[PDB]
Symmetry: C2
Subunit: 297 residues, 2 copies
Amino acid sequence: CRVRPAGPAVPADCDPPRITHAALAARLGDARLLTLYDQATWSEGPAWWEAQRTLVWSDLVGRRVLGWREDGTVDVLLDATAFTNGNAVDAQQRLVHCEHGRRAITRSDADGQAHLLVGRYAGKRLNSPNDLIVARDGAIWFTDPPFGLRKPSQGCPADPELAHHSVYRLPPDGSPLQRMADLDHPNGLAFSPDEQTLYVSQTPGSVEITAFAWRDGALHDRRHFASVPDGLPDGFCVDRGGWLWSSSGTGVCVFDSDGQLLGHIPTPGTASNCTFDQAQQRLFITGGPCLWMLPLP
Amino acid sequence: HCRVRPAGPAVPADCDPPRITHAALAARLGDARLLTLYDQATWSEGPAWWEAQRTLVWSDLVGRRVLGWREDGTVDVLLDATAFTNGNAVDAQQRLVHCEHGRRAITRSDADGQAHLLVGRYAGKRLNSPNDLIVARDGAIWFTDPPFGLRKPSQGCPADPELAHHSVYRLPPDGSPLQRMADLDHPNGLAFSPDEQTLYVSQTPEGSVEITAFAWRDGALHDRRHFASVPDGLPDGFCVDRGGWLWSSSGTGVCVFDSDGQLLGHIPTPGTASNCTFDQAQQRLFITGGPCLWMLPLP
Ligand SMILES: [Ca+2]
Ligand SMILES: [Ca+2]
Ligand SMILES: [Ca+2]
Ligand SMILES: [Ca+2]
Ligand SMILES: [Ca+2]
Ligand SMILES: [Ca+2]
């Protein structure tokens, strides 16, 4: 099912970027936000799919996983989903998903069939996987806040079986799921370029982006990394240079590897997540019924 | 089949009380105040009272579910991951019948909780996107076929219609086939008068936005005429009571008209109302609108 015909993007109705740092000013130039789709209900988890040169993201509430093609076309990749939220792409260019409904991590084939990868920790059902990433070694890392258990429009209500909201690492060899850290409503996550630092946001309690040291098979030196001026640092991404681009109530905030705020990119509505394409020349941002994109020069 | 709302008392709705000018309607309502039975959907539609299960069945069109309100306040998912089910109705055998934007057809559910196809084409071409339906005393299913489900991603799958008309159809209980009874402009809600001599059908285009009345005599609809216009918004879905009054949804709540088309009063609702229906005894009025399912308990 094609939900948007091929066609050019239309400028988004919002104020141009507010840039402080000269380095970010050079990166964005006079780029202006564009609207790629605006017919969803609750856009989430954008992930660039190089193998298909498609931007994958889901409409959590509409229970679909959509795919934006470079010609502007938007197709339905997965329909009538079990409330899929976050999306990611593995080393084999396969799509992996966080599903609120099945409360698990799944992986789709070519037929568009999402197969279960894990739905329990130590024999107890996960809360409701929210966002995920795939490390270079193939392990899938993800957050498990209880959001999918407290809102009917986003899953099936239920009292949690687990007494913790954790960040987990699913080994690529089939070994047991690993509880890496307990947080307060962990949400988005992303590794630093060298994977020595893992960033995870918490959106209950302190609303922030937390940093962890990834070394010797565990997470260490937990500390506050950054806070966004408005709203929640929901989903976010880190570019090859080390900058963290995070969603927020008013748009996307950009921070350097030291946590310094460099600038803000307004969006017409609350932003839920964001990611870059392969070349990192296009910044995709999800939020409400929309998929926005900022073309960098 | 999960439970989306635990059992528990309803909460009064945050809206103004009924504005009643008619004395007869003031008596019918008494001091009744609107209640909220559910507020966690996205686009509530097609409420239908299911006597056999003493449950109010309705759809969350955008959320792709058909929900069921139990009298203790519990709300369960009756049909999940639907093909954008909109209108719901109950046939003589107490089976649920549905209008599905996605499958562009009329379907019927079994005790298995599975909706099976009844009809999805006219003259070999796919229907536009069945919106609302009713079941006549003779078992025939009547429904409206506007193209809403073909021009909004959040409510179906976009496509160019195969039919060059938006019709009201009649599906015979014996041997079909579908009967094209009338063509309208975005036909939406529909309901029969108690004696079934008049069929009311609303038209809600982007040419008139109104509730239209037809004469149902012989084997066709005759004498098309304007019946009423609601003060605000669209007369989406509506129902008719045993006395002949037509209770219709609108942008500000439910409007009540007598059989002569005279406005009797207005029942404010906190948000736009999409449809409404009564329970078996017609002692409780259920109203759908956005994330909500509201109810007005009559004395
Ligand atoms: Ca589910
Ligand atoms: Ca998230
Ligand atoms: Ca990501
Ligand atoms: Ca579809
Ligand atoms: Ca309708
Ligand atoms: Ca009805």
